[PDB]
Design a protein around this ligand. Structure first.
Ligand code: MG
Length: 171
């Protein structure tokens, strides 16, 4: 189904920060030396973590796991929940809970893309830390400055909410 989260996520001018519509994304890291992060390229495609809006009566963790399973067939039982990062949000009215999880590196080998996902990409955390990070800043209506990030990885452009979550994960 269509999710408002995907609309706001593609809004080039929607600002994301951390500090009424609720959503969650799964931030799965492989259990290895140089951890890889599970990311998707939606059917240039929108780069995002598996995720979506919470259904009624559903928690952030349940949503994140369901979305990863619906999108790339990631079995929730393959995920060890590590807790969550701080919520990231945008003025318009979206609160996103990044749910952290750890999976075996092998788990990636058998994931299966569904129609809404074009490909699965797995940047290594080392790589994302080494890429020439783009740091811009915009000001909100209240006059508050806010940092914007963009990770130029292998020709792809990871930006917006996803990059904000990524940067927080890296810090
Ligand atoms: Mg969905």
């Amino acid at each position: 189904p269509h999710d408002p989260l995907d609309d706001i996520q593609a809004d080039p001018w929607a600002l994301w920060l951390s500090g009424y519509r609720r959503a969650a994304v799964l931030v799965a890291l492989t259990r290895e030396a140089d951890p890889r992060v599970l990311l998707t390229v939606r059917s240039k495609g929108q780069i995002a973590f598996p995720g979506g809006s919470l259904d009624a009566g559903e928690t952030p963790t349940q949503a994140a796991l369901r979305e990863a399973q619906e999108e790339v067939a990631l079995d929730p039982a393959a995920v060890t929940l590590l807790g969550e990062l701080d919520d990231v949000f945008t003025p318009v009215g979206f609160h996103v809970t990044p749910v952290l999880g750890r999976i075996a590196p092998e788990a990636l080998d058998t994931l299966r893309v569904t129609p809404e996902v074009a490909q699965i990409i797995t940047p290594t955390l080392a790589e994302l830390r080494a890429v020439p990070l783009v740091r811009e800043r915009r000001t909100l209506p209240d006059g508050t400055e806010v940092p914007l990030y963009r990770y130029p990885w292998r020709g792809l452009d990871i930006w917006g909410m996803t990059a904000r979550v990524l940067h927080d994960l890296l810090e």
